[PDB]
Ligand binder design. Structure first.
Ligand SMILES: CCc1nn2c(C)cc(C)nc2c1Cc1ccc(-c2nnc(C3CCNCC3)o2)cc1
Lengths: 212, 225, 371
């Protein structure tokens, strides 16, 4: 029941930059908050225990502290190796263990809107009784994006999927794609299937569309 | 050397069961409390279960009470998690972690050692090879620029599908998206390569789709109409 | 009227010599126990012997002679000793107030300073600095003949100019600077002690009320959350109990808290099992553990109060022994340096000069405040 809330669910920072991650306990927790670093595909590693002390082997770059119920993790200077998801964890008792939701430290970059492409369904899947329309957003620098699927200008919901790549190892950008799922019966109707893409880096939504 | 080694994961149908193991090296199972921590794909960490073989004390997260049983056998220096009546929601990577006993540093230091983790996937889906579709670019799209060409690898199961282009020759400008689980219980990938518009003609591009679990290899040519 | 100084000095010699010898003995024994304050007290006690060994001649001067039969060098020497005693005593009382401040306010931050070797290095610096500041006449004798007479040993009635300026320096830097530091240390001690004490009451109340609820709780969920907060309080209190020098009493408190936390865990798991007997388990085990550490806690509270008493009594000592002298020295300097009780001021000044010798009595008293 002792919930922990991490504020900066996503934090962008440069290499050499100062990073602060703040976590709040729902109730009093003694200095029994640990911080863990998780890299994709790996089990979490302990960085800080007892809301302060470093675990042996952990670089001096890491530190943290408690102020009442507010706990922080500070990376004094990010190294290329510190871009990881950090978790806040409460340890008052074996059965009461809870984790915060985690905060991801991303590599900071400048802003650029993605290139947007539409990939219509073709005969090789339409013959199976299904259809799918794929909208692709390439090389977006910030993480946040919103993609709306519209058919004959109706806004659809609940019939699409989305997938986002990790920051590219050379560019530090993201690519996003989404798929509109239709049965053949739905694809056989309507004329225009459009992808409306809105980003913080755009002054206005950009649309690309498929006219059957 | 201090190790926690998980094993026993795999594919189970809903309502079925798995017995995960956590072998210890360096330290004994009886020397510390063992915890299972779960990580659903794309989610944060969830504590699942605890055992302390030194006191005979166990506990479970509310989400698994009466469903999971945790036990240990110190004669083999191995702990176990018995997962019965599994639901789709139990798909996750299960990690075994070491937290010591109060008083002192072994307790304040919490999950110092984690095992490698093992994946439990709960699904009614049978093994399926892919349906592979050409996401060919239109010649009218972003004309004069870089075209995005790709392949859609649809309705496959289980998870570990590898897609490469031109048999490993094309790595530059290639984005393979994480598969999305479909409502059908099957998965779908999309793999896109960026190519100079002119290269449309020539440089035929092949999506090489490999599914070890279904002994299936599919080679598709992606070409504009 | 004129017999006051001799009588005060005879009293001071008779009391200070036995008591400065006993103070040096006690301070040395305190040093053997690795109490760094025994070094400062030893430095204080020796300074008070150095002055006392000169007082027997001043009394004879006042009672049997019409002048200073010992010659100008015995006058320059006794003046030097007098000034060094005053400023050595002030500097060491300040050092004591600042290491009690650090000991209570920053118990785990400046641990390297609460050591005998550090205190000796500090005393060496203090002694060299005081001796240098008051040694100027020993390198030029015009100074002693611009400030002091050489037929009687007192400071000349008018002040040359530099004499009043050095008197203002010594009043402001010698007295007022370390006095202000002692007052700041006292208030910092009061704040640090009142905060630690107040924080140690918050934990006691959360523990007490959570135990009361466990006593009357029905559903296991409430026993569980009560134990959760009991544990948080116990860990916070142990943190409050964690100090850098590993004092023997604090180690015992740490062990007691470990026992308490273990009992809380035993009850917490018994409760998770669902056996209602946890109510009596916790209601008896935590009560039994609290039943004995309370007397030690009371001793600790008394110790903190006795630090407050030391800082306040030490300030009172500095203000009774030295304030009337620096006050009349400042008043007699503000006159030369400006434009009538004026002679009337000169036997209140001399009476306050004699009155400053009671720091040879106060110094051996501090022994009853340290331990
Ligand atoms: C307050 C006494 C005192 N103690 N003291 C010390 C410890 C150190 C120093 C540096 N100065 C002093 C003084 C100042 C001081 C004040 C008056 C005299 C003085 N006047 N006449 C005489 C004789 C004796 C009495 N009948 C007339 C002739 O003595 C001397 C000195």
């Amino acid at each position: 029941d002792i919930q922990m809330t991490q504020s900066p669910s996503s934090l962008s920072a440069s290499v050499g930059d100062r990073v602060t991650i703040t976590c709040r306990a729902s109730q009093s927790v003694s200095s029994a908050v640990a911080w863990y670093q998780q890299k994709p595909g790996k089990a979490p590693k302990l960085l800080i225990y007892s809301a302060s002390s470093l675990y042996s082997g952990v670089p001096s770059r890491f530190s943290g502290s408690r102020s009442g119920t507010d706990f922080t993790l500070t990376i004094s200077s990010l190294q290329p190796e510190d871009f990881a998801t950090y978790y806040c964890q409460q340890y008052l008792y074996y059965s009461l263990v809870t984790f915060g939701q985690g905060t991801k430290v991303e590599i900071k970059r400048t802003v650029a809107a993605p290139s947007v492409f539409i990939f219509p369904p073709s005969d090789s899947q339409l013959k199976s009784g299904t259809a799918s329309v794929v909208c692709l957003l390439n090389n977006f620098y910030p993480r946040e994006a919103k993609v709306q699927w519209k058919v004959d200008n109706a806004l659809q919901s609940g019939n699409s999927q989305e997938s986002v790549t990790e920051q590219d190892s050379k560019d530090s950008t993201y690519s996003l794609s989404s798929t509109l799922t239709l049965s053949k019966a739905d694809y056989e109707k309507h004329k225009v299937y459009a992808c409306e893409v809105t980003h913080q880096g755009l002054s206005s939504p950009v649309t690309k569309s498929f006219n059957r | 050397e201090v190790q926690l080694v998980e094993s026993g994961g795999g594919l189970v149908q809903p309502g079925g069961s798995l017995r995960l193991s956590c072998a210890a090296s360096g330290f004994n199972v009886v020397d510390f409390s063992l915890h299972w921590v779960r990580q659903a794909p794309g989610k944060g960490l969830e504590w699942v279960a605890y055992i302390s073989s030194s006191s005979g004390s166990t506990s479970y997260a509310d989400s698994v009470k009466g469903r999971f049983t945790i036990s240990a056998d110190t004669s083999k220096n191995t702990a176990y998690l018995q997962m019965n009546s599994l639901r789709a929601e139990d798909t996750a990577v299960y990690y075994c972690a070491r937290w010591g006993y109060w008083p002192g540093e072994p307790w304040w230091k919490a999950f110092d050692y984690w095992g490698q983790g093992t994946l439990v996937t709960v699904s009614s889906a049978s093994t399926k090879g892919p349906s592979v579709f050409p996401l060919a670019p239109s010649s009218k799209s972003t004309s004069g620029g870089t075209a995005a060409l790709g392949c859609l690898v649809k309705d496959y199961f289980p998870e570990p599908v590898t897609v490469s282009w031109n048999s490993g020759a094309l790595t530059s400008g290639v984005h393979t998206f994480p598969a999305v689980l479909q409502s059908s219980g099957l998965y779908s990938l999309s793999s896109v390569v960026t190519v100079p518009s002119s290269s449309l003609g020539t440089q035929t591009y092949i999506c090489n789709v490999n599914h070890k679990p279904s002994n299936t290899k599919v080679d598709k040519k992606v070409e504009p109409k | 009227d004129h017999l006051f100084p001799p009588s005060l000095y005879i009293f001071v010699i008779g009391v200070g010599l036995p008591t400065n010898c006993l103070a040096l003995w006690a301070a040395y024994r305190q040093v053997q126990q690795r109490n760094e304050l025994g070094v400062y007290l030893m430095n204080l006690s020796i300074a008070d012997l150095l002055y006392i060994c000169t007082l027997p001649l001043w009394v004879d001067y006042f009672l049997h002679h019409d002048n200073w039969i010992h010659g100008p060098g015995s006058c320059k020497l006794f003046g030097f000793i007098f000034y060094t005693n005053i400023y050595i005593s002030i500097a060491f009382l300040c050092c004591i107030s600042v290491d009690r401040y650090l000991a209570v306010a920053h118990p785990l931050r400046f641990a390297r300073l609460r050591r005998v070797k550090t205190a000796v290095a500090v005393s060496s610096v203090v002694w060299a600095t005081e001796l240098g500041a008051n040694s100027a006449p020993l390198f030029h004798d015009e100074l002693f003949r611009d400030r002091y007479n050489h037929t009687f040993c007192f400071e000349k009635f008018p002040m040359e100019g530099w004499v009043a300026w050095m008197n203002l320096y010594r009043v402001f830097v010698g007295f007022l600077f370390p006095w202000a530091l002692m007052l700041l240390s006292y208030r910092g001690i009061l704040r640090a002690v009142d905060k630690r004490k107040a924080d140690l009451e918050d934990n006691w109340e959360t523990l007490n009320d959570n135990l009361k609820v466990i006593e009357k709780a029905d559903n296991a969920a409430q026993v569980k959350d009560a134990l959760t907060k009991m544990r948080a309080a116990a860990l916070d209190a142990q943190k409050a109990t964690d100090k850098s020098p590993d004092s023997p009493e604090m180690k015992d408190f740490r062990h007691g808290f470990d026992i308490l936390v273990g009992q809380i865990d035993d009850a917490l798991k018994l409760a998770n099992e669902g056996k209602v007997k946890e109510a009596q388990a916790a209601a008896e085990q935590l009560k039994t553990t609290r039943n004995a550490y309370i007397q030690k806690y009371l001793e600790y509270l008394d110790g903190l109060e006795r630090i407050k008493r030391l800082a306040l009594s030490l300030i009172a000592i500095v203000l009774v022994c030295f304030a009337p002298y620096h006050v009349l020295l400042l008043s007699r300097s503000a006159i030369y340096l400006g434009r009538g009780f004026e002679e009337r001021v000169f036997s209140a000044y001399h009476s306050s000069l004699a009155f400053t010798s009671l720091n040879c009595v106060a110094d051996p008293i501090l022994y009853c405040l340290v331990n």
